[PDB]
Structures are given as C-alpha cells and as structure tokens.
Design an enzyme around this catalytic site. Structure first.
Site, PDB file in Angstrom:
ATOM      1  CD1 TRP A  37      -2.763  -1.072   2.516  1.00  0.00           C
ATOM      2  CD2 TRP A  37      -2.498  -1.914   0.435  1.00  0.00           C
ATOM      3  NE1 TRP A  37      -3.753  -2.029   2.298  1.00  0.00           N
ATOM      4  CE2 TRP A  37      -3.581  -2.598   1.060  1.00  0.00           C
ATOM      5  CE3 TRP A  37      -2.106  -2.333  -0.855  1.00  0.00           C
ATOM      6  CZ2 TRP A  37      -4.286  -3.638   0.430  1.00  0.00           C
ATOM      7  CZ3 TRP A  37      -2.890  -3.358  -1.508  1.00  0.00           C
ATOM      8  CH2 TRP A  37      -3.939  -3.986  -0.850  1.00  0.00           C
ATOM      9  CG  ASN A 161      -6.791  -3.276  -2.637  1.00  0.00           C
ATOM     10  OD1 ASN A 161      -6.376  -4.224  -3.338  1.00  0.00           O
ATOM     11  ND2 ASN A 161      -7.471  -3.468  -1.519  1.00  0.00           N
ATOM     12  CD  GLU A 162      -9.871  -6.640  -3.003  1.00  0.00           C
ATOM     13  OE1 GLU A 162     -10.683  -6.411  -2.092  1.00  0.00           O
ATOM     14  OE2 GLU A 162      -9.309  -7.768  -3.163  1.00  0.00           O
ATOM     15  CE1 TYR A 244      -7.830 -13.307  -0.520  1.00  0.00           C
ATOM     16  CE2 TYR A 244      -8.462 -11.624  -2.239  1.00  0.00           C
ATOM     17  CZ  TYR A 244      -7.564 -12.134  -1.284  1.00  0.00           C
ATOM     18  OH  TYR A 244      -6.422 -11.481  -0.978  1.00  0.00           O
ATOM     19  CD  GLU A 281      -5.465  -8.517  -2.718  1.00  0.00           C
ATOM     20  OE1 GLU A 281      -6.358  -9.170  -2.101  1.00  0.00           O
ATOM     21  OE2 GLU A 281      -5.375  -7.265  -2.634  1.00  0.00           O
ATOM     22  CD1 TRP A 314      -4.287 -11.778   2.250  1.00  0.00           C
ATOM     23  CD2 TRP A 314      -3.863  -9.905   1.087  1.00  0.00           C
ATOM     24  NE1 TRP A 314      -4.479 -10.720   3.089  1.00  0.00           N
ATOM     25  CE2 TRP A 314      -4.217  -9.557   2.414  1.00  0.00           C
ATOM     26  CE3 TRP A 314      -3.564  -8.880   0.157  1.00  0.00           C
ATOM     27  CZ2 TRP A 314      -4.274  -8.224   2.862  1.00  0.00           C
ATOM     28  CZ3 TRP A 314      -3.656  -7.505   0.582  1.00  0.00           C
ATOM     29  CH2 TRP A 314      -4.006  -7.210   1.939  1.00  0.00           C
TER      30      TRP A 314
HETATM   31  O1  LIG Z   1     -16.621  -6.544   1.569  1.00  0.00           O
HETATM   32  C1  LIG Z   1     -16.618  -7.811   0.826  1.00  0.00           C
HETATM   33  C2  LIG Z   1     -15.240  -7.849  -0.010  1.00  0.00           C
HETATM   34  O2  LIG Z   1     -14.373  -7.398   1.015  1.00  0.00           O
HETATM   35  C3  LIG Z   1     -12.994  -7.207   0.658  1.00  0.00           C
HETATM   36  O3  LIG Z   1     -12.316  -6.848   1.849  1.00  0.00           O
HETATM   37  C4  LIG Z   1     -12.395  -8.482   0.088  1.00  0.00           C
HETATM   38  O4  LIG Z   1     -11.020  -8.329  -0.289  1.00  0.00           O
HETATM   39  C5  LIG Z   1     -13.296  -9.087  -1.015  1.00  0.00           C
HETATM   40  O5  LIG Z   1     -12.724 -10.366  -1.386  1.00  0.00           O
HETATM   41  C6  LIG Z   1     -14.747  -9.202  -0.505  1.00  0.00           C
HETATM   42  O6  LIG Z   1     -15.640  -9.599  -1.550  1.00  0.00           O
END
Ligand SMILES: OC[C@H]1O[C@@H](O)[C@H](O)[C@@H](O)[C@@H]1O
Length: 357
Positions: A37, A161-162, A244, A281, A314
């Site tokens: 990060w 990130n995401e 995940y 990840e 991860w």
């Molecule tokens: O809040 C739900 C999502 O949270 C994130 O913190 C995760 O990295 C994801 O894999 C998950 O789907």
C-alpha cells in the site's frame, strides 16, 4: 518477466526490523515482486498508526505541529531502499476501495459526499486524488536520492485496490475514471507500468459463466467492473485480478475448480487483448475443509502452464513486535491467509514454485 509474488500492507508504517523481515523473507523464498500500500488517508487512520501520509486535503506527510509521529513517505522510502538492496520489485497501490487506511470513503467524507462512489464522480475529489498521486510519484526517496518516478525498484503503479462502483452497473463510470487517472499517471511518469488493481470482475460476457453457477455476481457486472473494457484502455499496461472463492459465495468443494475457471477465463481474455495479466491476490482460509496447499498448487500450475505473467498470494508477513506478535513472535495471522517463511506446506510450495516461474 514472469514471477511468484506476494502482498504486504504494513510496509509504510512498521519498524525497520519488521520491514527488513518481510523483504528478507521474500528474497529467501524466491518471491520477486511484493504488492504494497502507498496510502494512509484521513487523520483518524494516520493517528491510529502514528504515521501520516494524507491526513487532510493538501496535507502530505505529518501535519505542522504534530511531533513524535512517523512520516509514511519515509517508511515507504525505507521499504523501497531495502527492496532495491535485496532485489525485490514493488507494485505500489495509490488508494483503497475499502475503508482500511481511509480509502475512498475518507475522500468522500472530506468533500462532503454521500456515497462511496462519489469518489469517481466529484471533480473536487478527483483533483485531490491527483494532487496526492503527483506528490507521491514526484517524492525524492531520502535513502537513495532517486524520485519514485525514476526508481526501477518500483515495477508498477496501481490506481485503486479492489475498486468497485456498485451504483453504476453499466461499467461506464469506472472506465471513465480509469481512463482519466491512468492517463494522468502516465503524464507524470512515462517510465513505469500502470495497472488498475481491481479484482477482475466481468460484466456478462458471452460464454463466460461461473463454475457451478456460484458467485454469478462476479461474472455478471454487479460490482460495476467491466474488466475487459478496463484492460483495453491504452494507458493501462497489464490486467489484474484477485481470487477469494470463500468470500464470494463459492462452496468449499468448489473452491479449487471455481478458482481454476476464474484463472483460465482471465488468461484467455488477456491473451486475446494482448496484454500481460497478473493474479495479484489469492487466498483460501486456513480453516477451509480442503487442502489449501493443493488448491494453491493447482492455481499456480494453471498460471504457469497457461502463460499468465505472475501469481501473487495474499499475504506474506515477517517477525512481529508490540501488539502485533503471535505465539511464535511473528506478525499474527489475523485473517487466516498469512504465510511466513517457515516449514508449513504452503511456505514449502511457494519456495518450490519460485524456482519455476
Ligand atoms: O466486503 C466484501 C469484499 O471485502 C474485501 O475486503 C475483500 O477483499 C473481497 O474479497 C470481498 O468480496
């Protein structure tokens, strides 16, 4: 360049001892790339870690008048300088979709918005994100003299990130924001690779459906991410995806095959576009009623055999200290995904595959 990599999120606020331990562990294991990060947004989050990067709009580093604090740019400088020494390349992510370390919602709070996704739309927020990223990318590392924009130890910048944008399931909001921000970063730094840092969700592509009909939402555009459209952006150099199955609704007996299909689908799509793709990840919870190492072996074999560019678990941790130290002295396994440089079958698998990639 193809690799085994990992992630570590505390490289910008922990001590020299703890940073040295993660990077030495990566070098010992053969892990070539660490994704870390590069953000610490909001005064409460900065104060909680006694480390400052972006506590308020236009404040980069420690606020005037606060003494006895760490500067997260100096900790990142130490991390980069040690990674350089040890031969580890770094991917550095510039904001979090989630609230950990402030994230998008901290920017929305600063600017008085009303939903997380205002981060992609409000020009005052977009301007503050660009001011932060410009400060960071131009920052001169105090241990090397080299500005981050010229530092080859950094492999890539990642936008977010995401990232997700559930309020626009067409995908268009994210395409516009990624176009704007990836072009902006290229205007600051023509040297480094840029990627998004998202989870890889699809948006209802003909002939791509999930394994076993589980986690359809990751295939049908629920998050507002159209990965194929993002990967096609000129100023995006490689595609990222995360994995995940246990978080996304997949049953344990399907984790292996769901993940396998997910990897196959991402590599097929990236190969047709003609850009590299990184599984950046992945994780299975230590307590899942399946053999985690055999799942990790299956997924690493698929990335290796299908020609994907990298597989990054991860996450990697090292020795711990203070209130983050477990029964063996390591930084604790808080989320069930931690790997450390020990005799676990996962650690042995990572060392074995680092010799292959
Ligand atoms: O809040 C739900 C999502 O949270 C994130 O913190 C995760 O990295 C994801 O894999 C998950 O789907």
């Amino acid at each position: 360049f193809r690799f085994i990599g990992s992630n570590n999120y505390y490289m910008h606020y922990k001590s020299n001892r703890m940073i040295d331990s993660v990077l030495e562990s990566a070098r010992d294991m053969g892990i070539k790339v660490l994704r870390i990060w590069g953000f610490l947004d909001g005064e409460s989050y900065c104060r909680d870690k006694n480390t400052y990067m972006h506590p308020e709009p236009g404040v980069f580093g420690v606020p005037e008048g606060i003494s006895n604090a760490q500067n997260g740019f100096e900790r990142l400088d130490y991390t980069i300088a040690k990674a350089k020494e040890l031969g580890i390349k770094l991917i550095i992510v510039l904001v979090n979709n989630w609230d950990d370390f402030g994230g998008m919602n901290q920017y929305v709070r600063w600017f008085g918005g009303t939903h997380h996704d205002d981060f992609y739309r409000d020009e005052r927020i977009k301007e503050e994100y660009k001011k932060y990223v410009s400060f960071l990318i131009n920052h001169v590392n105090v241990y090397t003299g080299v500005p981050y924009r010229e530092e080859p130890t950094i492999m890539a910048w990642e936008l977010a990130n995401e990232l997700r944008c559930e309020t626009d399931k067409s995908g268009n909001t994210l395409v516009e924001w990624v176009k704007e921000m990836s072009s902006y970063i290229k205007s600051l730094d023509p040297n480094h690779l840029v990627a998004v840092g998202d989870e890889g969700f699809f948006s209802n592509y003909e002939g791509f459906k999930p394994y076993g009909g589980e986690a359809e939402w990751a295939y049908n555009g629920w998050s507002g991410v159209d990965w194929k459209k993002l990967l096609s952006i000129e100023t995006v150099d490689f595609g990222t995806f995360h994995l995940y199955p246990s978080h996304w609704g997949v049953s344990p007996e399907n984790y292996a095959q769901w993940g396998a299909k997910w990897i196959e689908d991402h590599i097929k799509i990236a190969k047709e576009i003609g850009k590299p793709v990184v599984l950046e990840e992945y994780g299975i919870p230590k307590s899942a009623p399946v053999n985690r190492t055999a799942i990790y072996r299956l997924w690493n074999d698929l990335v290796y055999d299908l020609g994907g560019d990298g597989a990054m678990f991860w996450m990697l941790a090292g020795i711990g200290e203070g209130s983050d130290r477990d029964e063996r002295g390591y930084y604790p396994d808080y989320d069930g995904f931690r790997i450390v440089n020990d005799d676990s079958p996962e650690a042995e698998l990572i060392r074995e595959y680092a010799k292959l990639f």
